Design a protein around this ligand. Structure first.
Ligand SMILES: *P(=O)(=O)O[C]C([C])([C])[C]([O])C(=O)[N][C][C]C(=O)[N][C][C][N]C(=O)[C]([N][C]=O)[C]([C])[C]
Ligand SMILES: *P(=O)(O)OCC(C)(C)[C@@H](O)C(=O)NCCC(=O)NCCNC(=O)CN
Ligand SMILES: [Mn+2]
Length: 1774
């Protein structure tokens, strides 16, 4: 051992590594600060271990301790060196691992000592990756430190490569810590920089225009009125005016104004200014003369291009150049010399309508060129197109209208104001001129979609929010987005389908869009933020407004990129598109809620009568705002109709107050909807709506005020619906309590039946005011010890089973900015300690009574630590330590400070912190952190315990206990979730998965619930119940637990304590009824339970007398909780932490956050894994969406499996197609014989038959059979034992044309007569001893008489097609008389070809004929040698029962393929153990029954080099269907039947015909090529069993009647027949599991495991009885025990027997009696241990679950050694 200097800056001081070093007995000196070269911490040090050291060691230290400085870097070096390594391992897609290396004089460039490869998942968050990485580096240390310190590890140098990263290189990706890996990479692809851009723009516009004028000189360029201009005519006239302009003084970047109207001269003037060198400044001639003067002066334009009509509007302010004066045009018609550069200004357009007078946005040439060069190839603009110059030339819409199409050879058509506003006449012009492409603003576009157009192929829109996609035309609709500051548009979207929010699209050429937060950091995909524009569209800025330009055009502080601040909110969608979410300022507050009014219009337009809609948010002088819904419809729509229409998907405040009908929306002069021309509502006054009905009496007013107080709404109406206007379950109780003060008693259920004030009055009008309904909580007087509540006693008892358990520790974190004072937070928390007695309460035990003791003051543990992002979790994990309930405060806190945040953490116990208590702690801490004063508390928890303990003596309490005792009487339901194998003892290890319901779906969920008089909890509980039922094999009843607030007295809603109560919920799902029906059923069962919600759970269990198993939890195993929305802002930024704990098998908590729902899936990791839960989360989402849209659909019609799961099943199971030769088997033999005539084909006894000899004898009997009247699909029955004649018969039947029907010769005549009839067959090819056995049925031949053969040895002609019958195998199945399965040739061929592909029988191979030919397996032996041209060794009759003989055949005949039904393989392997003969055997193909798991090793030990295979298949799928290859080193838990064969498909379906997902059981169904034609002469049965199904798209499926389940591997597991299913108390019983467990003991070799119906037709499993139960007590659950198959020895056991008999109540207790079998509860163990402690016998309550008997726990209860003598025994006074 030696001294180690542990260097850590961001990790803990007592990490797992330091402790492992201290266990190996090292002295670990820990230094967290910078060490100096000659410090004391450096003396007498033998090793230096570093872990997250945030300093650099001096070069002397590195050299002085060279080879002795070890670092722990959580990265696979050389990759991701430096800082934040795990994140950069994911973002840069580098290899993943951990490295223990040596420290040099640089950053992580040392010789690697040991290195492991970690693996991160796609569904893992970055935080999960941090945790996984930190563990690996700590385990790698524990695993290799001894090899390192002892020099057993040779350092190898770092390989070439790697990345190096520094601190603050991550400041842009800070909001991405809770994002999954695949999502992180998706954002990277979607937002990263490409490859140094495309190509730089090296051209101006006039340059490219002059190149197009040379390409299409004589094409029409512009068309105004009836006259036209060609490209060359336009170019030359512009060139003429440009020579005039340039000579007049136009220089680059100069601003020349144009005040012309839409004409041919406007296009000439625009190109003239450009060719001269300037930028055109469009001034609309109709603008106010002041606006005109402003632009001219702001633009500092010396030259104005106008005419004589608009001349005087300049007031002599510029050099007027008349565009009609000929002297203004020169004689030079040639292209001017170029004086411009791509960075030169091209135009300046003024934008206004808001703050400021008007700002001049300046655009450059490279900006426009980049747009025009993207426009042409994107829309396929050709010289054949015609475009419309629609927008005013003062708006960038005209830039698109003019410049984009000019660069493509198209023709511009000028639009006079005569048609710009008559859009019927515009459609005329377009249709009669062939206008193919144009840009129409949103409002004008939505009013052009009604016109009937045939000319347009592409119509682009944008400007406002597009809602309408239905149009009377054949043109494509495109939606664009872009500010004027960038060029025209930056994103485009093709509207392909209806959308609620039509995306604005994807960025264009050389343009990138980022969604950033307030700190200018990258938001994750789907998270909203401000849109930022990067690329070649961004212009210079604003004219003479440098402040606003620096404000909106910012260079990013981190990415170093110029970006434009849009001020618009948007989010990226997963497809790569962006969607506009509104302006970051245009949110109004309604009823106290900030909303976007544009989120309402889409729902209103979905009304079948509304075509156009617009929602405005006007206000009154009082200040409050109201929403007005303007709509265009054929006629007016009733107000209540629009209110109801929106009530299906929207909340009350998002429903507009008033609606206004319009015939046509007024449009501004630029194609937008004139919002300020929309009629203002007359009744703005104060009209609380047309729905407002004022209270008409004193009670309606009294109720309306109480409703106002509880709901927060002013002036309620007598028709307002409680649940529709914010009503919650908590608010219902608040209404009830506020009514008790009035004197009126209302029941919880009566509110849901009277949800308006109108109805409530009728309920309460006859009541009389009764005083005393609400009695104050009496403040207890001072005592030494106080009373504890029922929950506090429970929680105490829980923490006593494992005194070191953290399963009920409550850990929350809040991330504060670094500007918060850490000590201020601690001071506030120390104020919260004295403010609440719970934070100073301790719990002790007085005899057998748990009591509370209040302490006047307690000191808080406030640990300050420094850490990094990838270490915060690790630091916090080492701080969750067990709590001693006798010590206060029961809360520990601390602040972890990083370089970007201060993370406050606090850890409490459930005994004090519950749901509401957390919300009060939030609000109070937030108020204290704001230095706000708090009114001192008024009540205390210790008083509520007194009141409630007295209520337990009331009559109401007994009334409620009786409810639960009858509710949970009788056999309760059993919810068998598709879990992993349940561990014997209960485990609490867990993880969490999270599912987010978006705000849109959340809104539809709540609106749906309120509309049908339900709460969101009721609606969620129903979906959860259906979800559980569909996993419990579509059970009709389900059971689960829930949690209530538990605040009985209304005075306890401000206290800090444990109030919540756990309730058992027994609900029912009717799959034959609708979702709406089931919703009411759940409520009809929830409300009675909430009426008896104040009985403690332990008493409910006792009233129900619930049996205690060990694999499951008491009454339920799945828990569903729900929390409301956060009350404060601190509560919304609190984060609950799971320490890897799952109190139940599965817990679902719904949390309302961010206007959506965060659903947590806490699960036991021993029962579910990462993949399983992910499947269940997607199934819940699938059911939720199906339900919220299928309110009236039957629940059976909701499918649990998902489409992704269906595709996954297909590949892993049912992708089995293979092309197989259609040559029949009877031909194959005759072909083989012709080529190998003298090769061995059959071997019987010691005689051999060759292919030629076989074939020839076959041919003879065939020629005989042919003239006997044998044609295709004829049946001739066989009566023969194993011989060569049976083989000749079969093949001859097939050559003649018929099908062969094997009948056992030794079958009773009763049977034969049956098949003789059912088949209706005539020929009976029988052997000599059985010719008369046919009783001369019809024509009976003799296979042994040569008369029944013929002379012709030539191959009979082919007379069969691949669809003809080849054989008919009767079934004689259970509960049935023999039925004839008809198998065709191509069916048999497929199995033979597929089995050969798997187990090929080649020429040098052989099969053994040992299966009786009345079983289909024999067919695989009869024909399995033909494909590969092998041979068949016919075993002697009745030798299948002699393993001696079977073995001999394998040895002497070199057999490779053999079939063995299980139970006949065991006698075979019991013979081969004491044997050593050589073998050629290759495959043991097993089928017929389930393979015992013990058989697999038994086989591979007597026959190594063999390949054991388990194969399954019903007779109706020819022979086989699925197979599973077993391996030597394997221990399959049920031994699966496997995956289907080639061209086979297997489906597991439920009782309603739906594909079951993995784990969920159902009926196995076969489909594919090798299916039976049907049952012979039983078309009834053929219809019930061979049914068409949508899975096979009308093709048939065979219902096997076998229960089966899919496996994560994909292999199907056999679960038995659907009938003959054994269930104890609703749980399925697998008799093999109990047999397997009853066999591994040497004493037992014979294991009988079966069920007997007993007493009232009830069933019970039958097979040392209590010892046998003990052997099965472990491993097996108490529903799987066979119902049918006093001696204390030391003082301790006598003492234990006495104490047990008192607590358990069993007068007679034995040392071998099971605690839980005698009534052992968790309550009992505490009593037993406490009575033992009082007599100095220390016993652990946990031990009672591991050692449940007296003698088993006897050596574990220790004595408390007492000291009898004192230090002072004799005293002498002096
Ligand atoms: P209605 O809306 O149909 O009401 C149904 C309920 C859910 C029964 C309602 O009445 C109710 O009681 N809501 C509050 C229940 C509650 O307290 N939920 C949170 C419970 N969880 C905890 O107390 C702990 N862990 C996580 O929350 C705690 C340590 C924070
Ligand atoms: P014992 O074998 O441990 O069981 C008997 C008890 C009644 C003591 C035990 O089952 C019990 O306490 N059940 C109720 C506790 C419970 O289900 N949840 C705890 C309450 N807190 C939460 O559920 C999380 N918010
Ligand atoms: Mn490092």
């Amino acid at each position: 051992m030696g001294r180690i200097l542990f260097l850590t800056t961001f990790m803990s001081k007592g990490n797992k590594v330091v402790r492992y070093l201290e266990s190996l007995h090292h002295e670990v000196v820990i230094c967290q600060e910078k060490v100096h070269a000659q410090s004391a911490n450096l003396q007498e040090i033998d090793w230096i271990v570093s872990y997250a050291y945030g300093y650099i060691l001096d070069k002397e230290i590195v050299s002085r301790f060279r080879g002795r400085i070890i670092n722990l870097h959580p990265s696979l070096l050389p990759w991701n060196k430096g800082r934040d390594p795990v994140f950069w391992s994911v973002w840069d897609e580098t290899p993943k691992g951990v490295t223990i290396h040596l420290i040099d004089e640089h950053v992580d460039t040392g010789d690697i000592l040991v290195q492991e490869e970690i693996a991160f998942a796609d569904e893992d968050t970055l935080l999960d990756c941090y945790n996984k990485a930190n563990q690996a580096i700590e385990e790698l240390f524990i695993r290799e430190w001894e090899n390192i310190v002892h020099g057993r590890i040779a350092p190898y140098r770092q390989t070439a490569g790697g990345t190096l990263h520094f601190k603050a290189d991550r400041d842009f990706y800070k909001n991405l810590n809770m994002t999954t890996v695949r999502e992180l990479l998706a954002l990277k692809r979607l937002c990263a920089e490409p490859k140094r851009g495309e190509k730089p723009i090296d051209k101006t516009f006039h340059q490219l225009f002059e190149q197009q004028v040379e390409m299409t000189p004589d094409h029409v360029a512009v068309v105004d009125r009836g006259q036209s201009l060609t490209y060359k005519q336009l170019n030359e006239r512009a060139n003429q005016l440009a020579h005039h302009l340039r000579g007049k003084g136009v220089k680059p970047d100069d601003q020349v104004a144009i005040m012309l109207d839409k004409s041919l001269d406007m296009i000439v003037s625009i190109l003239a200014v450009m060719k001269a060198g300037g930028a055109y400044v469009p001034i609309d001639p109709d603008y106010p003369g002041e606006r005109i003067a402003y632009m001219l002066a702001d633009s500092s334009a010396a030259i104005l291009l106008t005419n004589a009509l608009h001349e005087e509007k300049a007031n002599g302010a510029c050099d007027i150049i008349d565009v009609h004066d000929p002297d203004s045009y020169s004689e030079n018609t040639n292209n001017l010399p170029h004086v411009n550069r791509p960075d030169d200004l091209v135009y300046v357009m003024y934008t206004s309508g808001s703050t400021g007078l008007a700002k001049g946005v300046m655009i450059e040439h490279h900006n426009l060129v980049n747009f025009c060069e993207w426009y042409r190839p994107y829309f396929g603009v050709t010289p054949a197109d015609k475009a419309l110059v629609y927008s005013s030339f003062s708006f960038d819409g005209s830039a698109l209208d003019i410049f984009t199409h000019l660069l493509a050879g198209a023709a511009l058509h000028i639009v006079p104001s005569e048609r710009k506003y008559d859009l019927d006449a515009l459609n005329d012009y377009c249709n009669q001129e062939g206008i193919t492409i144009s840009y129409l603003p949103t409002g004008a576009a939505e009013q052009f979609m009604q016109m009937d157009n045939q000319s347009f192929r592409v119509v682009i829109t944008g400007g406002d929010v597009l809602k309408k996609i239905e149009r009377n035309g054949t043109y494509k609709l495109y939606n664009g987005y872009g500010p004027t500051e960038c060029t025209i548009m930056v994103t485009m979207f093709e509207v392909d389908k209806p959308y609620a929010n039509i995306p604005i699209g994807k960025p264009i050429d050389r343009t990138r869009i980022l969604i950033l937060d307030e700190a200018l950091a990258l938001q994750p995909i789907g998270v909203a933020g401000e849109l930022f524009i990067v690329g070649e569209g961004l212009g210079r800025g604003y004219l003479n407004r440098p402040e606003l330009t620096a404000e909106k055009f910012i260079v990013h502080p981190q990415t170093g990129e110029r970006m434009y601040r849009t001020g618009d909110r948007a989010r990226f969608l997963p497809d790569g598109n962006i969607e506009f979410l509104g302006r970051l300022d245009n949110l109004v507050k309604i009823r106290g809620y900030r909303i976007e009014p544009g989120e309402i219009e889409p729902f209103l337009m979905n009304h079948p009568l509304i075509e156009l809609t617009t929602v405005l948010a006007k206000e009154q002088a009082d200040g409050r705002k109201y929403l007005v819904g303007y709509y265009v419809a054929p006629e007016e729509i009733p107000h209540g109709e629009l209110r109801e229409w929106l009530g299906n998907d929207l909340p009350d405040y998002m429903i507009p107050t008033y609606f206004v009908h319009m015939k046509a929306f007024p449009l501004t002069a630029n194609g937008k909807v004139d919002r300020r021309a929309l009629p203002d509502v007359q009744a703005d006054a104060e009209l609380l709506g047309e729905d407002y009905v004022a209270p008409t009496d004193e009670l309606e007013q009294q109720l309306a005020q109480v409703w106002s107080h509880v709901l927060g709404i002013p002036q309620m109406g007598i028709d307002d619906h409680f649940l529709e206007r914010g009503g919650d379950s908590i608010k219902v109780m608040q209404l009830i309590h506020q009514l008790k003060n009035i004197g009126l008693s209302l029941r919880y259920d009566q509110l849901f039946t009277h949800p308006t004030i109108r109805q409530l009055k009728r309920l309460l009008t006859e009541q009389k005011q009764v005083n005393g309904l609400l009695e104050p909580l009496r403040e207890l007087d001072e005592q030494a010890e106080y009373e504890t509540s029922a929950v506090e006693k429970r929680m105490y008892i829980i923490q006593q089973q494992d005194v070191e358990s953290i399963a009920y520790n409550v850990v929350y974190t809040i991330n504060f900015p670094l500007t918060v004072d850490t000590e201020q937070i601690r001071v506030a928390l120390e104020q919260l300690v004295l403010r609440h007695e719970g934070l100073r309460s301790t719990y002790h035990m007085r005899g057998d009574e748990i009591v509370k003791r209040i302490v006047p003051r307690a000191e808080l543990s406030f640990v300050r630590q420094t850490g990094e992002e990838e270490s915060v979790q690790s630091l916090l994990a080492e701080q969750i330590k067990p709590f001693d309930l006798a010590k206060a405060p029961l809360l520990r806190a601390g602040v972890i400070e990083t370089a970007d945040k201060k993370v406050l953490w606090f850890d409490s116990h459930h005994i004090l912190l519950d749901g509401l208590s957390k919300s009060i702690l939030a609000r109070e801490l937030q108020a204290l952190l704001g230095q706000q004063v708090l009114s001192p508390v008024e009540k205390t928890y210790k008083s509520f315990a007194r009141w409630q303990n007295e209520w337990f003596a009331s009559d109401e309490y007994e009334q409620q206990i009786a409810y639960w005792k009858t509710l949970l009487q009788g056999e309760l339901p059993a919810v068998q979730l598709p879990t992993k194998k349940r561990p014997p003892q209960l485990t609490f290890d867990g993880a969490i998965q999270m599912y987010r319901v978006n705000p849109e779906i959340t809104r539809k969920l709540k609106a749906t619930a309120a509309k049908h008089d339900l709460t969101l909890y009721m609606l969620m509980l129903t979906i959860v119940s259906i979800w559980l039922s569909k996993m419990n094999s579509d059970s009709n009843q389900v059971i689960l637990g829930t949690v209530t607030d538990g605040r009985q007295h209304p005075d306890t809603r401000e206290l800090l304590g444990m109030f919540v109560n756990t309730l058992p919920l027994l609900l029912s799902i009717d799959h034959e009824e609708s979702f709406l029906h089931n919703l009411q059923q759940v409520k009809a069962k929830l409300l009675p339970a909430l009426q008896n919600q104040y009985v403690p759970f332990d008493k409910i269990l006792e009233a129900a007398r619930v049996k205690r198993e060990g694999n499951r939890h008491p009454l339920f195993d799945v828990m569903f909780m729900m929390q409301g929305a956060p009350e404060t802002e601190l509560e919304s930024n609190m984060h609950h932490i799971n320490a890897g704990i799952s109190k139940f098998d599965l817990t679902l908590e719904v949390l309302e956050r961010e206007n959506g729902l965060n659903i947590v899936f806490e699960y036991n990791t021993h029962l579910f894994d990462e993949g399983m839960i992910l499947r269940m989360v997607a199934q819940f989402e699938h059911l939720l969406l199906q339900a919220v849209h299928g309110l009236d659909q039957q629940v059976k019609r909701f499918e649990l499996v998902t489409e992704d799961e269906k595709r996954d099943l297909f590949l892993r199971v049912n992708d089995t197609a293979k092309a197989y030769p259609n040559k029949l088997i009877m031909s194959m033999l005759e072909d083989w014989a012709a080529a190998t005539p003298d090769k061995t084909a059959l071997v019987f006894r010691e005689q051999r038959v060759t292919y030629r000899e076989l074939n020839e004898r076959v041919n003879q009997l065939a020629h005989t059979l042919r003239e006997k009247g044998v044609q295709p699909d004829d049946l001739v029955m066989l009566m023969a034992e194993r011989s060569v004649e049976m083989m000749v018969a079969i093949f001859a039947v097939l050559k003649a044309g018929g099908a062969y029907l094997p009948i056992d010769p030794h079958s009773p005549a009763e049977r034969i007569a049956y098949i003789f009839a059912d088949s209706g067959a005539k020929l009976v090819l029988a052997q000599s001893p059985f010719v008369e056995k046919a009783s001369m049925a019809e024509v009976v031949l003799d296979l042994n008489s040569a008369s029944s053969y013929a002379a012709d040895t030539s191959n009979p002609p082919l007379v069969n097609q691949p669809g003809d019958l080849v054989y008919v195998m009767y079934t004689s199945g259970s509960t049935g008389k023999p039925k004839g399965v008809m198998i065709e040739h191509g069916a048999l061929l497929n199995v033979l070809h597929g089995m050969q592909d798997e187990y090929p029988l080649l020429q040098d191979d052989a099969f053994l004929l040992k299966t009786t030919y009345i079983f289909d397996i024999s067919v695989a032996e009869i024909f399995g040698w033909v494909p590969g041209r092998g041979k068949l060794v016919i075993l002697e009759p009745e030798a299948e029962k002699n393993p001696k003989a079977i073995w001999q055949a394998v040895v002497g005949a070199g057999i490779t393929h053999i079939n063995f039904v299980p139970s006949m393989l065991i006698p075979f392997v019991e013979y081969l153990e004491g044997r050593t003969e050589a073998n050629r055997l290759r495959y043991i193909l097993a089928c017929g029954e389930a393979m015992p798991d013990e058989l697999v090793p038994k086989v591979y030990e007597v026959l190594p080099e063999v390949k054991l295979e388990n194969i399954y298949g019903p007779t109706e799928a020819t022979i086989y269907a699925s197979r599973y290859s077993l391996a030597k080193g394997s221990q399959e838990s049920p031994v699966p039947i496997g995956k289907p064969l080639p061209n086979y498909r297997m489906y597991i379906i439920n009782r309603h015909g739906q594909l079951q997902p993995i784990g969920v059981p159902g009926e196995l169904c076969i489909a594919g090529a090798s299916l039976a034609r049907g049952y012979l002469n039983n078309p009834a049965l053929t219809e019930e069993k061979f049914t068409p199904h949508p899975l096979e798209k009308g093709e048939r499926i065979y219902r096997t009647g076998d229960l089966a389940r899919y496996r994560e591997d994909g292999n199907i597991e056999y679960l038995g027949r659907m009938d003959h299913q054994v269930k104890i108390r609703g749980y399925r019983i697998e008799l093999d599991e109990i047999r397997s467990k009853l066999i591994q003991e040497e004493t037992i070799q014979d294991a009988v495991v079966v069920a007997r119906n007993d007493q009232n037709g009830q069933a019970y499993l039958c097979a040392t009885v209590g010892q046998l139960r003990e052997l099965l007590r472990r491993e097996l659950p108490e529903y799987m025990i066979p119902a049918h198959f006093a001696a204390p020895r030391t003082e301790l056991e006598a003492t234990l027997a006495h104490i047990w008999g008192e607590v358990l109540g069993i007068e007679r207790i034995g040392i071998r009696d099971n605690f839980f079998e005698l009534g052992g509860d968790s309550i009992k163990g505490l009593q037993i241990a406490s009575r033992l402690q009082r007599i100095n016998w220390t016993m652990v309550i946990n031990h009672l679950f591991l050692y449940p008997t007296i003698e088993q726990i006897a050596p574990f209860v220790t004595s408390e050694q007492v000291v009898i003598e004192a230090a002072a025994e004799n005293l002498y006074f002096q």
